[PDB]
């Protein structure tokens, strides 16, 4: 009876603190910035071979190798320049939802509705790809995973928690609690000190890896948050939701900067990404295509319109010369 | 091109061959999703994710039981959904109706037919005959209901259980008829804990579903 009023007073204090800093908007300082113009991108490669919906995709650090996962139960490594296949990896379960590629190029990870994250070793003397470890402990399904190094990985699940794992022993070293709903997406900072997580409670949190504490909580969306990307300099969020809106958050002004929306878009958003310089923001929709946004102006610079079903995957290479997309029509396309 | 690139191309071609080989076996199995509440008797209708397999007349089926807002999206390619309701617990039928409405009107399931099992009929018969609890206590509109003239009761059945069964089945069928517009169909059935025929019913309904798809493909409907 006494504590709810204290919580409301603290929330009002935070709300009043945030309003004091809103002395300008992006829409006014960018009045002196030229538009990017019209951007045309064309298909350069088509990658064929999957027999089911594609759910996950990830680039390597050398900008040629690519990993993808689908409901046919197989995980494929592609050579983007020649379209040759390098490996084909069977999965023990076909209900896969995420995959990731190690920054050193030695390992690959995946997981799904089996509540387990599985790690594969790509470099053996026998010539085969083998399973190295199974990480158990979550109670919901596994929604996203990313490597920090060869021995540390972060996972997010549908049981409202996040975890940091020690791959050598298979034990959970930090558990991150504080959400009230299912957790969808993670994005790891370039300096590998902080990560950001979205959830079905329409909020986003900033976590400190080394201590296990929540530092900030952001709000504003009206429905589930499906995707998060992390601006290159380490100080901004890009988030997308089922309410057909994208938003840009700042960690130092601790409030929203710009909203990306249009009257003709009434479907949800599946994927969000940036280019190297941060000028373009790429987004996937249920309207069977992908839009190109001007991150500093909230205009629409272009569109990619080559798929016959939902776009589920979107990614950009480390050298910035290519974009890959994936759909439920079982195809991948390389754009430039 | 270099000899090493030709060897890489041969490896890629062999991988494509083996990917094509595996797909042929996958298409020969029909996949089913099983949903239902506790106490409904899900586990007995054909007796992270639990699985079961069974075969009738040389056609294989694969049924999945998970454990609903998010994981449901990946089950939009299944042939049919099986939904099981306990028909002998009057307090919790409104929950079953609300769940049925939430599954019928889901935007990711707009082309999937539902096979509906109304379970535990013997307990309903015993309770209606005993008369210690009445439907009118929870459903006032039952006081005005009459058994239709085209009813086909099983011989020997008391004409107070047929009224209850048809009222309960009407309550579920009425939701399905309000929306859908011909793209997907509901298939009601009455069952009990001791029945064994349940496997054949699924086979017949699946054959009907595939027949409807083939008729639509040929510009006949």
């Amino acid at each position, epitope marked *: 009876d006494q504590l709810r009023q204290e919580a409301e007073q603290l929330k009002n204090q935070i709300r009043d603190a945030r309003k004091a800093c809103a002395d300008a908007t992006l829409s006014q300082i960018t009045n002196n910035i030229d538009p990017v113009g019209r951007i045309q991108m064309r298909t350069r490669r088509t990658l064929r071979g999957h027999l089911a919906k594609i759910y996950a995709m990830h680039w390597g650090t050398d900008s*040629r190798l690519l990993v993808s996962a689908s409901q046919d139960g197989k995980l494929i490594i592609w*050579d983007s320049y020649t379209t040759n296949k*390098v490996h084909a990896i069977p999965l023990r379960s076909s209900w896969v939802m995420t995959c990731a590629y190690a920054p050193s190029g030695n390992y690959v990870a995946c997981g799904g509705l089996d509540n387990i994250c599985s790690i594969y070793n790509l470099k053996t003397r*026998e010539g085969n790809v083998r399973v190295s470890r199974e990480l158990a402990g979550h109670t919901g399904y596994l929604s996203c995973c990313r490597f920090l190094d060869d021995n540390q990985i972060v996972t997010s699940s549908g049981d409202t928690t996040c975890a940091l794992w020690d791959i050598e022993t298979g034990q959970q070293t930090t558990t991150f609690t504080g959400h009230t709903g299912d957790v969808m997406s993670l994005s790891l900072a370039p300096d590998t000190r902080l990560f950001v997580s979205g959830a079905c409670d329409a909020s986003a949190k900033l976590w400190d890896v080394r201590e296990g504490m929540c530092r900030q909580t952001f709000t504003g969306h009206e429905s589930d948050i499906n995707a998060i990307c992390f601006f290159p300099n380490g100080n901004a969020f890009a988030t997308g939701s089922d309410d057909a809106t994208c938003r840009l958050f700042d960690l130092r002004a601790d409030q929203e900067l710009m909203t990306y929306s249009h009257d003709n878009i009434i479907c949800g958003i599946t994927s969000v990404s940036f280019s190297k310089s941060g000028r373009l923001l790429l987004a996937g929709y249920d309207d069977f295509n992908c839009n190109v946004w001007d991150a500093l102006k909230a205009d629409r610079a272009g569109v990619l319109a080559g798929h016959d079903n939902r776009v589920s995957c979107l990614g950009v290479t480390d050298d910035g010369m290519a974009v890959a997309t994936g759909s439920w029509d079982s195809f991948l396309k390389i754009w430039n | 091109v*270099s000899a*090493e690139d030709k*060897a890489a191309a041969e490896r890629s071609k*062999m991988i494509d061959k083996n990917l094509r080989e595996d797909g042929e076996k996958a298409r020969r199995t029909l996949r089913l999703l099983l949903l239902g509440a506790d106490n409904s008797g899900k586990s007995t209708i054909v007796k992270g994710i639990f699985e079961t397999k069974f075969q009738v007349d040389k056609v294989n089926f694969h049924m999945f039981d998970v454990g609903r807002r998010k994981w449901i999206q990946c089950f939009n390619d299944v042939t049919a959904i099986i939904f099981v309701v306990d028909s002998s617990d009057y307090n919790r039928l409104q929950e079953a109706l609300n769940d049925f409405k939430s599954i019928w009107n889901n935007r990711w399931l707009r082309t999937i037919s539902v096979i509906l099992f109304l379970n535990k009929q013997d307990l309903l018969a015993e309770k209606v005959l005993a008369g210690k609890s009445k439907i009118e206590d929870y459903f006032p509109e039952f006081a005005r209901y009459t058994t239709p003239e085209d009813a086909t009761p099983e011989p020997g059945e008391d004409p107070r259980v047929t009224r209850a069964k048809y009222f309960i089945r009407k309550e579920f069928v009425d939701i399905s008829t309000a929306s859908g517009d011909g793209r997907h169909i509901c298939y009601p059935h009455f069952t009990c804990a001791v029945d064994t025929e349940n496997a054949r019913r699924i086979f017949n309904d699946c054959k009907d579903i595939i027949l409807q798809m083939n008729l639509r493909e040929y510009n006949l409907v």
Partner: single-chain antibody
Amino acid sequence: VQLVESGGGLVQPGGSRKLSCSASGFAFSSFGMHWVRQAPEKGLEWVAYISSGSGTIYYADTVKGRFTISRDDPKNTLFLQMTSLRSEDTAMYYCVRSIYYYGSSPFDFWGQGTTLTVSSDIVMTQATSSVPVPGESVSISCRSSKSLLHSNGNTYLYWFLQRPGQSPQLLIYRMSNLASGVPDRFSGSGSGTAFTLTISRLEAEDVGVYYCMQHLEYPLTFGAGTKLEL
């Protein structure tokens, strides 16, 4: 990872004999295989090659019509059938494992070998016969008749070491990639038609004959060999 060769012995000119190799410890069906020959006073020579799926077969220009290479995946054995043997066929025969995909190491493991007793090409040139020489720096050179640099950015040069009583061991592939298990004392470089190998600090285990091989076009060719005498 183990490869064992069998067969061999003494034959008369005009006869025939068949060799076999038994593989274990790895996915035999995923690798391509080579036969390489060494004569007492000649160095190494390439003989034949069979692809992993038995798709393609190549032969040397001195053995076409006389030698036949075959594969048996379910039993993990290779065979080489030889007919109409000549005096020039007396030599040591080695079995070599190879796999090709982006980033692989195609000549990593060599067998032990067996003995047989009877009774346009790119030229790779090495010329010093012996380098006299612990703790000193040594540089060994090779030179080719045609450029080994392909338009895709790769240059196809390989280095091998043969210690006394041992099979050749892979050191460097594609001119600069240090093979697994090798200490970081070895390095290599070059451009176009001239190549060098550098050893930063010698030990007692760095004594033997060093070979160069090119892998642009078939037939495969080797150099004469440079002997390092400590």
